[PDB]
């Protein structure tokens, strides 16, 4: 089997991407944030505290003839941005882009933190990291990908995120029309439950490539690119008037600037992030200070190849017995 679904930016900055997901019978379609940095499929629901719902589409398990309470199961998750959610669990039929899993754990939110309530565009998350990170207790549950894997033509999914444009998530096949040149594959460690890999280095604009190992995670659920402070300082030093602002919480730059590109290594290959991808717009409406898309990972404890980096590539999440990542230009 295969599936193919379009993923669409939630706003003009590509702050996140939403993908429609069919849950239950008859189908209830929710727009979920596909997150390769977490392993829970959770939704706004008929159980969510009413004051914490503001415009989201909700899953109502009592309206699904295939929904079954997973008796005794709870979940509770805290993300790297300080957001959180928790609740109970149903199993139900979940389809993405024509690919159907029966008996998928659908984690129904009873509580969500303010950032989720305040974002009317995201109806929940679909985790695509390794199932070892799933929070359901006392019986840990599998991701949608892990449950689909055996049925797929090839045990893979791909992320093809757009810059200010829709893109695609494919499951079970590699669309050889969606990228240029060849795919370069690189080793993955699953020891922390992430798609963790080691970049071979970086360049700033037209500068020389610096060969240096950068361990990090391919994370579709993180907006920006978070890298070691040395690398980030070297990038922003090439932008007149850029500075790290403790009050704003990262590097800012004059909105009048033209940003240089950023290149990262994948083995002997190179992925170029155009400068425009690194512009996240005014810090507040009408400000001439703009927020940078490359930020320090210092304090986070891990480097994160988020959407800024991933949207410059066609990315293969290879879930073979030994997982690997693939990157192609496009
Ligand atoms: C786990 N991937 C999605 C997500 C939630 C919060 C964050 C984050 O803070 N990244 C820096 O990422």
From Swiss-Prot:
Q: What class of enzyme is it?
A: hydrolase
Give a GO biological-process term: proteolysis
Annotated ranges, domain Peptidase A1: 17-328
Instruction: Supply the name of the protein.
Output: Endothiapepsin
Q: What is the active site of this protein?
A: 35, 199
Which source organism? Answer: Cryphonectria parasitica (Chestnut blight fungus)
Which gene is this protein's source?
EAPA
Could you tell me one molecular function GO term of this UniProt entry? Answer: aspartic-type endopeptidase activity
| Keyword tags | Aspartyl protease, Disulfide bond, Hydrolase, Protease, Signal, Zymogen
Q: Which cysteines are joined by disulfide bonds?
A: 255-290
Its Enzyme Commission number?
A: 3.4.23.22
UniProt similarity note: Belongs to the peptidase A1 family.
Instruction: List the catalysed reactions.
Output: Hydrolysis of proteins with specificity similar to that of pepsin A, prefers hydrophobic residues at P1 and P1', but does not cleave 14-Ala-|-Leu-15 in the B chain of insulin or Z-Glu-Tyr. Clots milk
């Amino acid at each position: 089997s295969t599936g193919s679904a379009t993923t669409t930016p939630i706003d003009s900055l590509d702050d996140a991407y939403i993908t429609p997901v069919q849950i239950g019978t008859p189908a209830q379609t929710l727009n979920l944030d596909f997150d390769t940095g977490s392993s829970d499929l959770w939704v706004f629901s008929s159980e969510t505290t009413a004051s914490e719902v503001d415009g989201q589409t909700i899953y109502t398990p009592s309206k699904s003839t295939t929904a079954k309470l997973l008796s005794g199961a709870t979940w509770s998750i805290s993300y790297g941005d300080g957001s959180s959610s928790s609740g109970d669990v149903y199993t139900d039929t979940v389809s993405v882009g024509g690919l159907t899993v029966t008996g998928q754990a659908v984690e129904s939110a009873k509580k969500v933190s303010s950032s989720f309530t305040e974002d009317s565009t995201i109806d929940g998350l679909l985790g695509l990291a390794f199932s070892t990170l799933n929070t359901v207790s006392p019986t840990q549950q599998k991701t949608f990908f892990d449950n689909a894997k055996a049925s797929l033509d090839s045990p893979v999914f791909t992320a093809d995120l757009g810059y200010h444009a829709p893109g695609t998530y494919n499951f079970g096949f590699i669309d050889t029309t969606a990228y240029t040149g060849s795919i370069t594959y690189t080793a993955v460690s699953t020891k922390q439950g992430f798609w963790e890999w080691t970049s071979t280095g970086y360049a700033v604009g037209s500068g020389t490539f610096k060969s240096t190992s950068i361990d990090g995670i391919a994370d579709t659920g993180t907006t920006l690119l978070y890298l070691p402070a040395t690398v980030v300082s070297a990038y922003w030093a090439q932008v007149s008037g850029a500075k790290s602002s403790s009050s704003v919480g990262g590097y800012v730059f004059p909105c009048s600037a033209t940003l240089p590109s950023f290149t990262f290594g994948v083995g002997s290959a190179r992925i170029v992030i155009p400068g425009d991808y690194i512009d996240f717009g005014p810090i507040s409406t009408g400000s001439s200070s703009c927020f940078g898309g490359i930020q320090s990972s210092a304090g986070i404890g891990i480097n994160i190849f988020g959407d800024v980096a991933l949207k410059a590539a066609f990315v293969v999440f290879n879930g073979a017995t030994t997982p690997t990542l693939g990157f192609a230009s496009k």
